[PDB]
Design a protein around this ligand. Structure first.
Ligand SMILES: O=C(Nc1cccc(-c2nnn[nH]2)c1)c1cc(-n2cccn2)cc(C(F)(F)F)c1
Length: 262
């Protein structure tokens, strides 16, 4: 009868899907895990790894984030809220990074993938920082197919929580780059209804959402409570029916339950 872990199990049961959670409380350096070693489709939470990888490149190419990149009609895919505003024009890698992270723009993600030499270049960065679980296999939008059992484009909650920590609290990146990632995450505009909706209003949050087929609804966050050691929280959720609707409420409830236990 584990404290937080039951409640999470009951939430899962109530939802009819599969929930995965990983919290890293950087006070104790304690951890709470629910299906923490199971694989989940990452969907757009993978945008953090791709942006982080371009930042890592920027450390030796100190002019890279300002490099103009052409946005061409053929580049546009299924959800391009920022990039469609610059078709037949250019956007910089900093603007593409913010577009990908703060509006979840898929054409922006693909430009980050291209800059890293394909999906294998995103996976490469993950390995370079000790993440042996993350794998990116496809570009946008097919990486969101979220097919049950499919290992493509998956990670585990434990692995992603550990990596989000190193990227945002640790030193997988250069301080200038880490601070830049933190700033990007904090001004994310998506996921008001996800993790953020389940946390005390007083806490500062940087997060990245994802969604896909099979009602896949994901959120990953680093959380600064006031007067307290920051937290890192991963909440992944996916459902048995291809036609399933999003359940952002499940992610808020998981977060609320985690925040109770603290
Ligand atoms: O591309 C997609 N979704 C997307 C695009 C941009 C941002 C976000 C996002 N950001 N934050 N939360 N969601 C999500 C997407 C979605 C679906 N799908 C089918 C049913 C429900 N969904 C399928 C596919 C695929 F068939 F090609 F695989 C792609």
């Amino acid at each position: 009868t584990s404290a937080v872990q039951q409640k999470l199990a009951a939430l899962e049961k109530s939802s009819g899907g599969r929930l995965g959670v990983a919290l890293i409380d950087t006070a104790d350096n304690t951890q709470v895990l629910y299906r923490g070693d199971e694989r989940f489709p990452m969907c757009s939470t993978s945008k953090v790894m791709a942006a982080a990888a371009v930042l890592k490149q920027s450390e030796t190419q100190k002019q890279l984030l300002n490099q103009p990149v052409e946005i061409k009609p053929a580049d546009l895919v299924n959800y391009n809220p920022i990039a469609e505003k610059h078709v037949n024009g250019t956007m910089t890698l900093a603007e593409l990074s913010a577009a990908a992270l703060q509006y979840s723009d898929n054409t922006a993600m693909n430009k980050l993938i291209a800059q890293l030499g394909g999906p294998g270049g995103v996976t490469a960065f993950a390995r370079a920082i000790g993440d042996e679980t993350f794998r990116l296999d496809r570009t946008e939008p097919t990486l969101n197919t979220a097919i049950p059992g499919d290992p493509r484009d998956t990670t585990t909650p434990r692995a992603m929580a550990q990596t989000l920590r190193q990227l945002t609290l640790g030193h997988a990146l250069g301080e200038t780059q880490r601070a830049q990632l933190v700033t990007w995450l904090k001004g994310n505009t998506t996921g008001a209804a996800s993790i953020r909706a389940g946390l005390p209003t007083s806490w500062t949050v940087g997060n990245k959402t994802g969604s896909g087929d099979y009602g896949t609804t994901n959120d990953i966050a680093v959380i600064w409570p006031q007067g307290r050691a920051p937290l890192v929280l991963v909440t992944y959720f996916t459902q048995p029916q291809q036609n399933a609707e999003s359940r952002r409420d499940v992610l808020a409830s998981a977060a609320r339950i985690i925040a109770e236990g603290l």
